[PDB]
Each structure stands twice: as structure tokens, then as C-alpha cells.
Design an enzyme around this catalytic site. Structure first.
Site: not given
Ligand SMILES: O=P(O)(O)OP(=O)(O)OCc1cccnc1
Ligand code: SF4
Length: 309
Positions: A12, A126, A225, A269
Site C-alpha cells: 500500500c 497500532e 501482520s 507489507s
Molecule cells: O500488523 P499490520 O498493522 O497489518 O501492519 P503491516 O506492517 O503488516 O501492514 C502495514 C500497516 C502499517 C500501519 C497500519 N496499518 C497497516
Molecule cells: S495498510 Fe496501514 S500503512 Fe497501509 S495504507 Fe493502511 S493504514 Fe496505511
């Protein structure tokens, strides 16, 4: 065997930005560059950055004086941010804009000493960061994970109440929590729908379409994740075998023996190279050319701060 790719999948905008921030800081300032928490929740990305001289830490006291420190994409509590600020450190913030937006709403409630409820998973960074934007003892900040948690929650003034969500939750499960919140607390204020980000919503919609066609789904992403876990969970709930894998090595042949149609996706990610390697492994086990599903187009990019160009 037919191989299908979910669309959208993979990186993303917040993740592309956050990794770029660490890469660029390494390029500009040399090793070491300190990073609070894994920059994103992907072993391959983190192992990579570590081999290039990033050092990942949980506490600011682990970071020496004079250093460069980067906050991860998941964000950080005010206590952590203030702890870093008091020190000689140079700080860059890789928190995703879509997290920050939630943080600001929590801080507004705190200033008003009015209570807020976060929907999310205990112990996730988070969640720590977002709960960590509320400090007013006269109000309160409560975490709920399920409708049952809502059903047992009591608050001090339910006339002045707001809610927020973690960005990476199940869209459908979150919908049930919100329905419960509104039945319990008819005056509760929130967003139109939830604080789940565009990337999470879209990847979930894509894996739903994928799992309608595939017998088995492989989700590229790490165990820690949140958003990746939701993609696997979604597929499994639809009656498909689904597996969350870091890379092609983890594929066990029994998982796809005599399977006519295998689907592959990736969490937000997970770098595309890992998916390409997964596809190559599936081809060895007898799959054809990978067919991308038609999907919703994503167009959002988040730029690095100007000081890191
Ligand atoms: O454990 P998740 O939060 O899914 O983090 P990941 O680093 O896998 O994905 C990116 C992200 C970062 C910040 C917020 N939401 C998503
Ligand atoms: S998955 Fe997390 S890092 Fe990616 S756009 Fe969403 S809030 Fe942002």
C-alpha cells in the site's frame, strides 16, 4: 493447475512510504539508523534493512544519544514521542497518514475529557499508539475487540462518546462491533463507517473474489501482520484452505496436490518479489501462467518528507 492473482494485493501507500523513509535515511546518514518497532510487519523487508544497517528496537532508552530514530508505520504513543523529543535524537516519523488521522481524533477527545472507544486487537503496536494518544483522567479510553466486549462495557458519560478503529481489521467483524456499539450507546459518534483503510478494504474485497474461484489461497505475509492474517481468515471462512506464508519455501506440496485452481495474494507489507517467487514455485508444482483478476484500481501515493528526498 490454474494460478490466479488477487487484485489489489501487496504494498500500500503507507508501506511504500515507510520503507522509503528507512532506505533514504540509510542512504543519507549511513548506518546505523534506529527504527522503533519493525518498520512494517514483514520479515523479508526487516531482515533486508537490518543487513543494510537499520537497528530495530522496542524502547527509546535502547537508542544512543546523537542518533537518527524513525517511528514505524504503525505509529507511537504520545509518551514515546515525548520521550524521543526530550532527547538529542533526530526523529523522522514513518507513521502512516491514515493512522495519524485516527490519532488526531483521539487527541481531540482527550482534550475534551470525553470518552472514546477503540475497536482493535490488544497488544498490537497500532493499538498501543492510538490508545497512547489519550491521557485525560477525567475521560477514558476503552478497547473493545468483539460485540461481547461492547456488551460488558460501562462508561462514565455515554452522552459524550466517540469511537475509532484500527486500520487493518476485518471489515465484516468490525461492522458487527459497531452495530453493537450503536445499540448500547445510541448517542455514540464516529466516522460514517469505520477507520479501516482503503488498502485493507480493497485487499479484503479482492481476496473474496479470489476465493470464489480458487480452492486454495496463499497469502504472502508475515505472522505478525494483522492485515495479512485477515486475508487468510477471510478465505478460510469462505471454506477454502488458506495459508499465510512468508515465502515460497513454506509451500508444502500437499497443499496444492490435485488442486485445479490456486489463488495468491499478499498483505500490504509484502514486497512483490515474494509473490513472484511464490508463483515460480507453484509453476514447478505444475501451475500455468499466473492470471491477474480484474480489480479496483488504487491510485494513492504518500510522499516521503522533503528532508528525506
Ligand atoms: O500488523 P499490520 O498493522 O497489518 O501492519 P503491516 O506492517 O503488516 O501492514 C502495514 C500497516 C502499517 C500501519 C497500519 N496499518 C497497516
Ligand atoms: S495498510 Fe496501514 S500503512 Fe497501509 S495504507 Fe493502511 S493504514 Fe496505511
Amino acid at each position: 493447475m490454474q494460478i490466479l492473482l488477487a487484485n489489489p494485493r501487496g504494498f500500500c501507500a503507507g508501506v511504500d512510504r515507510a520503507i522509503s523513509i528507512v532506505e533514504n535515511a540509510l542512504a543519507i546518514y549511513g548506518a546505523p539508523i534506529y527504527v522503533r518497532h519493525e518498520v512494517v510487519h514483514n520479515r523479508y523487508v526487516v531482515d533486508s534493512l537490518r543487513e543494510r544497517g537499520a537497528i530495530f528496537i522496542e524502547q527509546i532508552s535502547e537508542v544512543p544519544d546523537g542518533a537518527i530514530l524513525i517511528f514505524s508505520a504503525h505509529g507511537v504513543s504520545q509518551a514515546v514521542r515525548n520521550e524521543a523529543k526530550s532527547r538529542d535524537l533526530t526523529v523522522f516519523d514513518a507513521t502512516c497518514p491514515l493512522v495519524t488521522k485516527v490519532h488526531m481524533e483521539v487527541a481531540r477527545a482527550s482534550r475534551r475529557g470525553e470518552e472514546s472507544i477503540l475497536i482493535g486487537h490488544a497488544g498490537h503496536p497500532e493499538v498501543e499508539g492510538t490508545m497512547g494518544q489519550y491521557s485525560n483522567p477525567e475521560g477514558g479510553m476503552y478497547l473493545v475487540e468483539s460485540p461481547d466486549d461492547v456488551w460488558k462495557l460501562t462508561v462514565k458519560n455515554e452522552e459524550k462518546l466517540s469511537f475509532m478503529t484500527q486500520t487493518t481489521l476485518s471489515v465484516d467483524d468490525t461492522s458487527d462491533v459497531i452495530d453493537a456499539l450503536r445499540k448500547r450507546f445510541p448517542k455514540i459518534v464516529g466516522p460514517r463507517k469505520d477507520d479501516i483503510c482503503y488498502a485493507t478494504t480493497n485487499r479484503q474485497e479482492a481476496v473474496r473474489a479470489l476465493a470464489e474461484q480458487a480452492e486454495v489461497v496463499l497469502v504472502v505475509g508475515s505472522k505478525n501482520s494483522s492485515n495479512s492474517n485477515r486475508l487468510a481468515e477471510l478465505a478460510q471462512r469462505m471454506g477454502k484452505r488458506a495459508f499465510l506464508i512468508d515465502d515460497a519455501k513454506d509451500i508444502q506440496e500437499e497443499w496444492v496436490k490435485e488442486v485445479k485452481c490456486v489463488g495468491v495474494t499478499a498483505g500490504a507489507s509484502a514486497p512483490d518479489i515474494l509473490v513472484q517467487n511464490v508463483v515460480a514455485r507453484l509453476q514447478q508444482l505444475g501451475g500455468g501462467e499466473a492470471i491477474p483478476l480484474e480489480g479496483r484500481e488504487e491510485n494513492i501515493v504518500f510522499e516521503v518528507p522533503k528532508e528525506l528526498r
